Write a protein that binds this DNA or RNA. Structure first.
Length: 74
DNA sequence: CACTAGCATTGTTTGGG
DNA sequence: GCCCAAACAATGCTAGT
Protein backbone atom coordinates (compact mmCIF):
# COMPACT_ATOMS: atom_id res chain seq x y z
CA UNK A 1 0.00 0.00 0.00
CA UNK A 2 1.45 3.29 -1.23
CA UNK A 3 1.74 6.09 1.33
CA UNK A 4 1.55 9.84 0.81
CA UNK A 5 4.77 11.85 0.33
CA UNK A 6 6.08 14.04 3.09
CA UNK A 7 5.13 17.69 2.95
CA UNK A 8 7.62 20.34 4.13
CA UNK A 9 6.55 20.54 7.78
CA UNK A 10 6.72 16.76 8.19
CA UNK A 11 10.16 16.77 6.53
CA UNK A 12 11.41 19.40 8.97
CA UNK A 13 9.70 18.02 12.04
CA UNK A 14 11.56 14.69 12.06
CA UNK A 15 14.92 15.88 13.36
CA UNK A 16 13.25 18.62 15.35
CA UNK A 17 10.99 16.10 17.13
CA UNK A 18 13.92 13.92 18.23
CA UNK A 19 15.97 16.92 19.37
CA UNK A 20 13.04 18.23 21.43
CA UNK A 21 12.41 14.82 22.97
CA UNK A 22 16.02 14.36 24.07
CA UNK A 23 16.08 17.89 25.55
CA UNK A 24 12.61 17.60 27.16
CA UNK A 25 12.46 13.91 28.07
CA UNK A 26 9.23 14.24 30.09
CA UNK A 27 6.95 15.70 27.38
CA UNK A 28 4.45 13.47 25.65
CA UNK A 29 5.01 13.20 21.90
CA UNK A 30 1.63 14.76 21.21
CA UNK A 31 2.90 17.70 23.24
CA UNK A 32 6.06 17.94 21.17
CA UNK A 33 3.84 18.36 18.10
CA UNK A 34 2.43 21.51 19.71
CA UNK A 35 5.92 22.86 20.30
CA UNK A 36 6.94 22.05 16.75
CA UNK A 37 3.86 23.97 15.57
CA UNK A 38 4.86 27.17 17.38
CA UNK A 39 8.46 26.91 16.16
CA UNK A 40 7.51 26.34 12.53
CA UNK A 41 5.19 29.36 12.52
CA UNK A 42 8.18 31.27 13.92
CA UNK A 43 10.34 30.37 10.93
CA UNK A 44 10.81 32.93 8.18
CA UNK A 45 10.17 31.96 4.55
CA UNK A 46 13.92 32.22 3.97
CA UNK A 47 14.51 29.57 6.63
CA UNK A 48 11.84 27.16 5.41
CA UNK A 49 12.68 27.02 1.71
CA UNK A 50 15.16 24.09 1.87
CA UNK A 51 12.35 21.99 3.31
CA UNK A 52 9.88 22.90 0.54
CA UNK A 53 12.54 21.97 -2.01
CA UNK A 54 12.98 18.64 -0.21
CA UNK A 55 9.21 18.09 -0.14
CA UNK A 56 9.16 18.75 -3.90
CA UNK A 57 11.96 16.27 -4.59
CA UNK A 58 9.93 13.76 -2.59
CA UNK A 59 6.71 14.38 -4.47
CA UNK A 60 8.70 14.14 -7.71
CA UNK A 61 10.36 10.82 -6.80
CA UNK A 62 6.91 9.64 -5.76
CA UNK A 63 5.53 10.14 -9.27
CA UNK A 64 8.62 8.47 -10.79
CA UNK A 65 8.11 5.35 -8.69
CA UNK A 66 4.29 5.34 -8.60
CA UNK A 67 3.27 6.98 -11.91
CA UNK A 68 -0.33 5.77 -11.60
CA UNK A 69 -0.79 6.55 -7.90
CA UNK A 70 -3.71 8.78 -6.95
CA UNK A 71 -4.74 9.77 -3.44
CA UNK A 72 -7.86 8.03 -2.02
CA UNK A 73 -8.83 8.93 1.58
CA UNK A 74 -11.26 7.07 3.94
C1' DC B 1 -0.54 -10.26 20.50
C1' DA B 2 -4.05 -8.30 16.54
C1' DC B 3 -6.82 -4.80 15.15
C1' DT B 4 -8.61 0.59 15.01
C1' DA B 5 -9.41 4.95 16.92
C1' DG B 6 -7.50 8.96 19.01
C1' DC B 7 -4.12 12.50 20.42
C1' DA B 8 -0.81 16.17 18.38
C1' DT B 9 1.42 19.22 14.64
C1' DT B 10 1.15 21.50 8.98
C1' DG B 11 0.51 21.19 4.31
C1' DT B 12 -1.76 18.65 0.45
C1' DT B 13 -5.28 16.64 -1.68
C1' DT B 14 -10.00 15.02 -2.03
C1' DG B 15 -14.82 15.09 -1.92
C1' DG B 16 -19.09 16.92 -0.56
C1' DG B 17 -22.47 21.13 -0.20
C1' DG C 1 -16.51 28.49 -9.40
C1' DC C 2 -16.91 29.09 -3.96
C1' DC C 3 -16.54 27.07 0.76
C1' DC C 4 -15.55 23.48 3.98
C1' DA C 5 -14.23 19.09 6.63
C1' DA C 6 -11.35 15.74 6.90
C1' DA C 7 -7.82 11.87 5.52
C1' DC C 8 -3.07 11.12 6.06
C1' DA C 9 1.87 11.64 5.56
C1' DA C 10 6.32 10.80 10.30
C1' DT C 11 6.82 9.97 15.00
C1' DG C 12 5.43 8.06 19.42
C1' DC C 13 2.76 6.82 21.83
C1' DT C 14 -2.00 5.96 24.02
C1' DA C 15 -6.75 3.18 25.15
C1' DG C 16 -10.55 -0.07 23.95
C1' DT C 17 -12.00 -4.53 22.11
Amino acid sequence: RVKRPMNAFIVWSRDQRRKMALENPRMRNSEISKQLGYQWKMLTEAEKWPFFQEAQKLQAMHREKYPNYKYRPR
